[PDB]
Amino acid sequence: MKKIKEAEQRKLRRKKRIKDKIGRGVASRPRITVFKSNRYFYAQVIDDSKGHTIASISTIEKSLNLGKNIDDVKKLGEVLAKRLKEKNINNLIFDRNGYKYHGLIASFATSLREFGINI
Amino acid sequence: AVELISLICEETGIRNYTTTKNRRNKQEKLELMKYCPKLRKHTLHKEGKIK
Amino acid sequence: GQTPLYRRLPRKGFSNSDYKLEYAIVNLGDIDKKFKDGQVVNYDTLLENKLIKKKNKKIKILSNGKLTKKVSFEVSKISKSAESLVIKIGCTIQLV
Amino acid sequence: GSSKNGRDSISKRLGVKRSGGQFVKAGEIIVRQRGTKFHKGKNVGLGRDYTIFALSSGKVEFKTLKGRKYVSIV
Amino acid sequence: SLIGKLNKKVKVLKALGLNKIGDKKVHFLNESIKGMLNETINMILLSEVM
RNA sequence: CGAAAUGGAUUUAAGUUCAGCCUUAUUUUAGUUUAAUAGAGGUAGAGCACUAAUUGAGCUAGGGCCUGUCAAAGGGUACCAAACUCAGUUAAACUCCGAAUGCUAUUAAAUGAUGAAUAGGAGUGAGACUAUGGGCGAUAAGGUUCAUAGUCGAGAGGGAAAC
RNA sequence: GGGUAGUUUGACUGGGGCGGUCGCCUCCUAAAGAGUAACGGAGGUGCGCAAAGGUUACCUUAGAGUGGUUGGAAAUCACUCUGUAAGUGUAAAGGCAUAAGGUAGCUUAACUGUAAGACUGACAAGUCGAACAGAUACGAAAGUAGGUCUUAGUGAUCUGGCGGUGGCAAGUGGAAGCGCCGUCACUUAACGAAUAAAAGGUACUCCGGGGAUAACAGGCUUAUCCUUCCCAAGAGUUCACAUC
RNA sequence: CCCUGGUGGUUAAAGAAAAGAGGAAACACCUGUUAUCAUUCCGAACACAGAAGUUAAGCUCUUAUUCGCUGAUGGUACUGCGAGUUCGCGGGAGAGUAGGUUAUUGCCAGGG
Lengths: 119, 51, 96, 74, 50
Fold this sequence. Notes:
The structure is cut from a larger assembly and holds chains A, B, C, D and E.
Chain A: H1 2-22, E1 31-36, E2 41-47, E3 52-58, H2 70-85, E4 93-95, H3 104-113
Parallel strand pairs in A: 1-4
Antiparallel strand pairs in A: 1-2, 2-3
Helix pairs in contact in A: 2-3
Chain C: H1 5-8, E1 25-27, H2 28-34, E2 40-41, H3 43-48, E3 60-62, E4 72-75, E5 77-78, H4 80-89, E6 92-95
Parallel strand pairs in C: 1-3, 2-4, 3-5, 4-6
Chain D: E1 15-16, E2 23-24, E3 29-32, E4 38-40, E5 44-46, E6 52-54, E7 58-65, E8 68-73
Parallel strand pairs in D: 4-8
Antiparallel strand pairs in D: 1-3, 2-7, 3-6, 5-6, 7-8
The structure holds three RNA strands.
Keywords (chain B): Ribonucleoprotein, Ribosomal protein
GO molecular function (chain B): structural constituent of ribosome
Organism (chain B): Borreliella burgdorferi (strain ATCC 35210 / DSM 4680 / CIP 102532 / B31)
């Protein structure tokens, strides 16, 4: 009850502070946010001048058939990079979205980095 | 119990900075990485007298 | 009784008089308007043509206005812009 | 038995300097205050002493959200 | 008269164009003139220009 | 054509200086009053959610008294009473709320040298009273000291018996 | 060394003197922009901090109720309700859940040359400031950092001292000295500071003026004083009003 | 299009508590600490490795408005102005009351 509620509340507070520390995204340099469920891994690129998701990816996508490991998110970030290049976006701001930059997120971000995306 | 000290660039000896420091609290020899405008480069500055 | 402004404000330094090198300014536009080709713009001619007064004898040449006439110069100082323009027009410069 | 007190500081001239709807150019001071009586919205910045200033030319506007006032340049 | 009246009301009357007693001015009633007349109703006499 | 008796500073308080106010000349052209629309208050008022004051009931710790009480574990509560409930009140330095005016911006009318800048030249820097909002005093004083407006000051005439 | 000479010994002040006060900050007075007096009503202050700074990351009290060796109303711990009343070096106010609160790691931006555009303002001053260059600190990066959550912790000019730079160098060349940059020494607290250096009396007094300022009176007010009146609990054997 | 998850805008409680409904997908709880990480101790949170199980909880929907929040129309307080004076004109609360309120919406992904 209260313990789960306060865990949620802490996550929201962290999320909000992160958001206004990094600022909003613009069509030139939009914002990349992630979400880490118990099963999957989601990423979205958002332009807040419109509230529009320019691109997105997740491990649910059957064709990718990745898992939920460091290796899998490495490959997933590769796929995201190749999907964004054809829409000619190279600057992104990395909203860690209430998580700690470590492990899976670290591998995801570095994989976007080795392939010419400015985060 | 607070004295006005001067931070001196190590490699030139210029008294680049002046600051305040409390004696009788540390009586150490405060060192600070400060930017030495003669060299256009940061470096080490040590505590020293004023007069 | 308020401390006056010239006593609130501080001072700035000496005046360096008694050691100034003071001397007359003559401009290229003036030379163009007053002279012609071939003569020596110098102390004597500027004095008689009333571009300076014979109190000062260390003329400097500055570059206001434009000069078109080939002339010879015997002066004491010259600005870089003015001597560039004058060499370009094709005159000659001796520093005295 | 004289007065024990009688002591006052200099008035600091706080308050809103440009009214909502006025046209300002970059760098204008909008509010002088102690503390975020008014918070910062789009296109404004907060000084080290909570002054509100305009990052770009525009028209001042005040909004209210959950009872807090926000200043913006639109 | 304008003597002794409030400063604001003297300014309103001079904005209507009346400086003395016996001053005659024709005006077209819109919201502005209506507001000025309401401010200074006690010092004016309104007749209508057929 | 037309003041000031205000502000700032001062071995200043009967002085003097700067600003403001005034005038001459030139240049410049948008004061001010509304209406519409768009802004920020905590004043009046109101109120008890917050900080405090405080009334009658309900309820109840705790403390004291009494009662089969050794200073152990018990009970009666005429009381001293935290907290709590209902009802009703006080606050310039309390405000969960909040005007009317005033202030500020834009536009359209309306009013015609009222604005601003530069240059030249002063004077003033002792105010008083009335209609309001105040503080101090004794919700006393033609009292003292602030804010708005008017008058006298610098304004003749008519009226309030003279004033 | 007052034998003798030249001078100083403040102002505000509901007369003056005595007393008290003089810079700055917070709130009210202050009449809902700002500003706005008083010898109006309340406080703090002439610092502290090498972290109590900067950056990144991670977290939330106080109180009420309940259960626990000391441990009781209250120390520490668990949970429910409450949701900032807790806490922010230091006074108070305005603010602070994204916490500006708390903890931990790294670190010195507690930088240099600067600055578009402003607020406040008689002036002198004071404050905010995007952004640019160099050098960094932190973070993966975006970004932040030009001290302290903000608002008091302060002092002009002149003179003198120290360090750096090498402009000035009285015939020339050195040097002295000075300028420039960095910077120290004033309870100058009467704090926009008249001197580097300062106490009293004058009823023996004098001069220039003021009802702008006291004492005797005029005038205003009535605190105070005095003279009444309204209510009648009682006393008066009983009977509020014979009387008090 | 809809359910779910994630992400914006529109700020009126878009609030908590109690009761009922589900869980395909999705989400969450849940498994182990052994790999990098975190704790002023503690896989609680976080970190990493996975899918045995569930609606119990979180979440979604439906509920009496039980608590809160919001709020009429009038009237009053107060206020601008006035040769009408306890009035004439203009503006108009707070509180209380009749009520109302457990949002709405832009676009990304999975499939009904």
